[PDB]
Ligand binder design. Structure first.
Ligand SMILES: COc1cc(Br)ccc1O
Ligand SMILES: COc1cc(Br)ccc1O
Ligand SMILES: COc1cc(Br)ccc1O
Ligand SMILES: COc1cc(Br)ccc1O
Ligand SMILES: COc1cc(Br)ccc1O
Ligand SMILES: COc1cc(Br)ccc1O
Lengths: 302, 262
């Protein structure tokens, strides 16, 4: 822990969360710009938050170009400072900043590709992210996108056992979570990336539900109400209801009209109902969609 | 089989094997422990088994907590009157990591019989974190066992529960078990369990996965076989009691085999 709050000069606040507030700071000796996430152990009513215990322990071993790097942990008795590498913006603000311009297909492609590398790396190191959404993906000026906020992440075993329910921000939540399945796996992260893919194209959320059931219904109206054929077991699932409306699956070219043959192929496989058939981050790296992928810088500035 | 992460199971295995060497305690730490013994450790761990039953915690949590204690005690010298405070903070941290619903801190103070205060437990929580440098995602015997379990033809609950049980018995006795890695005890335990229940042996397929053979497992197997035979007589009994429960198929009631023909 070779770090001291005395070599940092606060610059501005760049975010906030349950944990607390994030500031951009500058290392006065090396010049390095960092994000400082402050956890107020001050509220030690129960000690060090489990969310922070998971975030720190899991990020300490997740070293990958597309996962935000934990640089240091400064550990007063009063406070706890997580020093993260500094990235300029998050994907949601960029999508807003890209309002009526669109995000260029090369950049969507590049971003999806990098997101898949980082998630594959998580999965290969027994870590589920469980809150992939645009607000939690950080971009730099150099064309990098990195998974961040591991506050809800979780070290899984093989095979998985039952973990916390109603995880993932609702808009990005996989159907097997919405249907209260006993077990969920790496597939839930893939689902999230699928939503984000579609969202990078349209700049609008794909399934913006206002409730668990409205969420399911939004999903079902787009991909079709699942049955024993498309998804064996579904009808047995704890929160499956036989009275669910049976919506026909609409043609996939209509879900995301600007998307090409390869794009649609990939999207459909990210959004397969059955977690067992849904594509892995690792297999998805090889999809033809990426044949011509490059890494361009973001077209706009911070 | 997404619950069994087909695309990542080997990556994960390979990764855990690396990590278990980094998260390993010093085999000979109790000698450099002036004021505590293997016997006191056995008492502490046996207690932690009861706490886990009391609060209906995962078995993974118990394994994590033991891992934390043995690494702390590998670098931090502890008086006998403080051994429990280490153990309680270990269990708290392990719960915050592994449990959906950790017991509240107050509950941890309670199970220590107000030996310690809520301040002491919290202050120790920080100390353990500083000593471990937050490195809490440690491979446990269980995380190995569950993978080995996929190699049964077919799955057998008695085999699984008994493997768990044997592996848990190993946590109690720093001597000899500190000298063996989680992946090796799990392999010993799996074969012992399999043999005992079905007469079967370490499968070829697990030789492929792990590189371990009954040849390389032999030392640990000989130890585990003894621990199994002498378990009714061991001063600590909480694991046997626990593994009477139907939850674990009453495996502690099964009779160990007299020889291993190994
Ligand atoms: C020991 O120094 C540390 C460094 C990092 Br990165 C995380 C936690 C620590 O405790
Ligand atoms: C001026 O250095 C500091 C910066 C922050 Br942010 C917090 C504490 C400090 O001492
Ligand atoms: C832009 O906001 C953030 C940037 C980094 Br780097 C870490 C956390 C944040 O909230
Ligand atoms: C589980 O809740 C619901 C189920 C159906 Br069907 C319709 C409306 C609801 O609110
Ligand atoms: C005195 O403190 C003790 C702690 C444990 Br754990 C076992 C035996 C003891 O005597
Ligand atoms: C002194 O008594 C005890 C000490 C420890 Br450590 C654990 C359980 C006990 O009963």
């Amino acid at each position: 822990g070779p770090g001291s709050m005395e070599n940092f000069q606060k610059v501005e606040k760049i975010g906030e969360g349950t944990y607390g507030v994030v500031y951009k700071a500058r290392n006065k000796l090396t010049g390095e710009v960092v994000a400082l996430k402050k956890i107020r152990l001050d509220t030690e009513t129960e000690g060090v938050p489990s969310t922070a215990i998971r975030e720190i322990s899991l990020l300490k071993e997740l070293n990958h170009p597309n996962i935000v790097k934990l640089l240091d942990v400064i550990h007063t008795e009063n406070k706890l400072y997580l020093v993260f590498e500094f990235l300029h913006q998050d994907l949601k603000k960029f999508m807003d900043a890209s309002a009526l311009t669109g995000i260029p297909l090369p950049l969507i492609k590049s971003y999806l590709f990098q997101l898949l590398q980082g998630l594959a790396f998580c999965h290969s190191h027994r870590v589920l992210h469980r809150d992939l959404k645009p607000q939690n993906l950080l971009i730099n000026t150099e064309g990098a996108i990195k998974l961040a906020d591991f506050g809800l992440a979780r070290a899984f075993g093989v095979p998985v056992r039952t973990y916390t329910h109603e995880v993932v921000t609702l808009w990005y939540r996989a159907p097997e979570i919405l249907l209260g399945c006993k077990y969920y796996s790496t597939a839930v992260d893939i689902w999230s990336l699928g939503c984000i893919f579609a969202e990078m194209v349209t700049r609008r959320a794909l399934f913006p539900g206002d409730s668990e059931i409205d969420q399911l219904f939004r999903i079902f109206r787009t991909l079709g109400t699942p049955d024993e054929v498309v998804w064996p077991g579904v009808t047995s699932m704890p929160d499956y209801k036989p009275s669910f409306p049976k919506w026909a699956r609409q043609d996939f070219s209509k879900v995301v009209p600007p998307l090409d043959e390869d794009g649609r192929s990939l999207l459909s496989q990210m959004l397969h109902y059955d977690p067992n058939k849904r594509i892995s981050a690792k297999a998805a790296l090889a999809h033809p969609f990426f044949q011509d992928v490059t890494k361009p810088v973001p077209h706009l500035r911070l | 089989g997404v619950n069994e992460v087909p695309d990542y199971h080997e990556d994960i295995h390979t990764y855990l094997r690396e990590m278990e060497v980094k998260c390993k305690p010093k085999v000979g730490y109790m000698k450099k422990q002036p004021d505590i013994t293997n016997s006191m450790r056995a008492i502490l761990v046996d207690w932690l088994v009861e706490v886990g039953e009391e609060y209906k915690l995962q078995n993974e949590t118990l394994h994590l907590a033991v891992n934390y204690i043995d690494r702390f005690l590998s670098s931090m010298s502890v008086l006998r009157g403080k051994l429990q405070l280490v153990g309680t903070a270990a269990m708290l941290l392990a719960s915050k990591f592994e449990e959906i619903y950790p017991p509240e801190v107050a509950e941890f103070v309670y199970i220590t019989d107000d030996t310690y205060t809520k301040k002491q437990v919290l202050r120790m929580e920080h100390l353990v974190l500083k000593v471990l440098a937050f490195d809490l995602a440690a491979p446990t015997i269980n995380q190995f066992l569950t993978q080995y379990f996929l190699h049964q033809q077919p799955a057998n609950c008695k085999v699984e529960s008994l493997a768990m049980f044997l592996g848990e018995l190993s946590l109690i006795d720093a001597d000899p078990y500190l000298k063996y890695l989680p992946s090796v005890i799990a392999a010993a335990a799996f074969h012992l369990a399999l043999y005992t229940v079905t007469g079967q042996s370490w499968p070829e397929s697990l030789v492929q996965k792990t590189g371990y053979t009954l040849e390389t497992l032999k030392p640990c197997l000989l130890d585990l076989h003894q621990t199994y035979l002498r378990a009714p007589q061991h001063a600590q009994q909480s694991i046997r009691e626990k593994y009477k429960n139907s939850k674990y198929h009453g495996v502690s009631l099964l009779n160990p085999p007299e020889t291993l023909n190994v």
